[PDB]
Amino acid sequence: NSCTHFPGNLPNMLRDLRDAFSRVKTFFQMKDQLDNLLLKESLLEDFKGYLGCQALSEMIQFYLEEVMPQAENQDPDIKAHVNSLGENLKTLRLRLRRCHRFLPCENKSKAVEQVKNAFNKLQEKGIYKAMSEFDIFINYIEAYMTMKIRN
Amino acid sequence: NSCTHFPGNLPNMLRDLRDAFSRVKTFFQMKDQLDNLLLKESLLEDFKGYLGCQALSEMIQFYLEEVMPQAENQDPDIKAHVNSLGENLKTLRLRLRRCHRFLPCENKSKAVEQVKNAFNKLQEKGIYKAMSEFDIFINYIEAYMTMKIRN
């Protein structure tokens, strides 16, 4: 129900991110007095190839935890607008993550989480069984590898 | 040069992991007195689909940091054999990571690392430029999204 209106609302969400940026753009454009470009175009190339998800994901995390927390304190009157731009961004991130695998690098295997929960419950007996089944773990790794080096 | 003999040596590496397991198998099979299976086959299904890399990666990390460190202390005479099985495993992991994208979920975008290094160097001016270019960051996110919802 987080995925109703999806993906038709993706363009609207970008439109709202861009309107949220507009209320902080002039403050930052005035304060930046350099003409060099920090987000080079090669960042767009990485977004288009096999590592795109991982690159966007790390850039979203870089702005939420490294740029925005320091920018918000640049001035009392822009703190809520910077904080609001971070919320449109977390909102977009969450929609891509949860709906139809648009940010797959951020998904987790539920099979892995079920093995980990069963192991934790067995406690010490969980160590002895995790090790006695290591040959089955090797069977699975061979399966992932043969899938790529053969056919 | 870590990738010479690759991928032809992948099968040998599995052969050595299996020989490394053999020297700890009987100790663990004796200690596990349960007949249930912990590594269910659904873990193999996740290894074959879109989330395979992430599932194997998390399972490799689960054995190196959660199972092996506790198993090694089960008995003085098996500590070096368990520790040796963990080294064949880290070795295999590293070869897949570094050679020809066999564990891509563990790779990092070098474009991202270059933006982060430039930002760090500019220090405070790095915050003002990261924010004045946020519209360019939105242009790149739109590019990743249109690539998937169109064509």
Side-chain angles (χ1 to χ4, degrees), chain A residues 42-107 109 111-134:
Chain A
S42 40
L43 183 66
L44 179 57
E45 297 292 342
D46 277 2
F47 280 22
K48 282 140 98 76
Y50 83 101
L51 271 192
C53 183
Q54 269 128 279
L56 168 59
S57 165
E58 188 180 9
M59 279 295 85
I60 283 176
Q61 172 169 312
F62 167 69
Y63 269 96
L64 291 169
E65 307 179 3
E66 273 155 73
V67 183
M68 295 161 158
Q70 314 248 112
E72 64 166 313
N73 302 317
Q74 284 321 114
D75 182 44
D77 273 319
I78 47 83
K79 175 171 181 313
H81 306 282
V82 170
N83 279 180
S84 285
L85 181 62
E87 288 298 318
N88 287 71
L89 185 61
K90 307 171 185 170
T91 289
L92 172 64
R93 188 217 225 148
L94 276 194
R95 192 133 303 157
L96 303 174
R97 194 204 285 158
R98 309 164 186 320
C99 302
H100 299 281
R101 344 306 191 176
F102 272 44
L103 201 58
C105 60
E106 281 195 7
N107 293 156
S109 153
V112 173
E113 197 174 285
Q114 284 156 217
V115 159
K116 275 183 167 180
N117 184 60
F119 162 86
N120 273 314
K121 233 232 153 265
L122 294 175
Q123 321 189 63
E124 65 291 322
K125 286 169 172 279
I127 294 152
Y128 312 125
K129 184 155 294 289
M131 293 290 310
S132 82
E133 294 190 10
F134 195 81

Side-chain angles (χ1 to χ4, degrees), chain A residues 127-150:
Chain A
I127 294 152
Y128 312 125
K129 184 155 294 289
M131 293 290 310
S132 82
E133 294 190 10
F134 195 81
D135 57 320
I136 289 159
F137 183 39
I138 298 168
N139 294 167
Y140 299 166
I141 287 173
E142 185 174 6
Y144 174 91
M145 279 187 25
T146 83
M147 180 170 62
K148 310 178 90 88
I149 67 175
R150 260 58 169 275

Side-chain angles (χ1 to χ4, degrees), chain A residues 32 46 54 63 104 109 129-130, chain B residues 32 46 54 63 104 109 129-130:
Chain A
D32 176 13
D46 277 2
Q54 269 128 279
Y63 269 96
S109 153
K129 184 155 294 289
Chain B
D32 176 13
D46 277 2
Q54 269 128 279
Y63 269 96
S109 153
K129 184 155 294 289

